[model samples]
Target: SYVALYKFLPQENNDLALQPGDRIMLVDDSNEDWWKGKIGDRVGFFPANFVIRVRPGENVWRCCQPFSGNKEQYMSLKENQICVGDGFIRVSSGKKRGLVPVDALTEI
Candidate 1:
């Protein structure tokens, strides 16, 4: 699941915590690669490798939260897109039912 690179931690001095399920805004940076703006907060930068864009309608390998709130960021899969790339499966029931890949999913 995509996560924030920095900011929104319990404390400002805390090290860069890579929460796997947090929603992040893409930031324009050089070293960090992708920047994420915290939901309802400011923005920050994170390494591209640190953030993984979960594909819409693909199965999640683990339980996680894709992002915060209703709005989520996602990348569409093309016909020749790689399997390991961003992709998700659409659920028919439970918490994630009727929702896209904006939220993390369980690997049932």
Candidate 2:
């Protein structure tokens, strides 16, 4: 079982939407960049880094009490910041992703 550290939205018709606390069974992991997992009959590609487990050179955990996007879009967190799409904060200004607290965001 794996937990989504960030939100993974289905860009395509067959993609899966993953959120925190969403339990998923790990399937094909031949590819580290993208792994196949099952979530409610929906199996698709998800970033290996977008998980709870820290990778090499990655920080274990942070009280980050705080905290990715288009080339020009990923500029900075001030210009643009979205919380719903991909669980983490997607700063189109700087192309960065950060942790999110529960109930910190709402749909507009």
Candidate 3:
């Protein structure tokens, strides 16, 4: 379980573009090349270097107040985070907004 504190734009970036506070379920972190995780609607690989281990409770998808598009953020989220931006999932944290790849947010 983890989320990013910044955005990682890979040369060969995955569908899930990571950013601060973007929650992901670390399904597999054994492989150094790619770490599998569940993000929003999708489950796939992401940068192992970017992920951080979170507690069981922290692993959960908490409602983050959106910086750009939302205010009274928690109230609006109700625990779900998302916004449409360049075919990516935008999650906000600490006044920082990040983009999530569509692949990261697959329709599961």
Per-candidate total of colliding backbone pairs = 13, 11, 5
What are the runs in model 2 whose C-alpha is more than 4 Å off? 53-108
TM-score per prediction, in order, is 0.35, 0.46, 0.42
Instruction: For residues 7-44, write the lDDT of model 3, one tens digit per residue.
Output: 65545545456765577777776878777777778666
The global C-alpha lDDT for each of the candidates, from Candidate 1 onward, is 0.40, 0.49, 0.50
Query: In candidate 1, where is summed lDDT lowest over 10 consecutive residues?
Result: 76-85
Judge candidate 1 against the unseen true structure and give its global Cα lDDT, from 0 to 1: 0.40
Query: What tens digits encode model 2's per-residue C-alpha lDDT throughout 5-108?
Result: 56788887655678754556788889878877888987887877665532343322222222212444332222113322254432111134444432344332
- Name the candidate, 2 or 3, with the larger TM-score value: 2
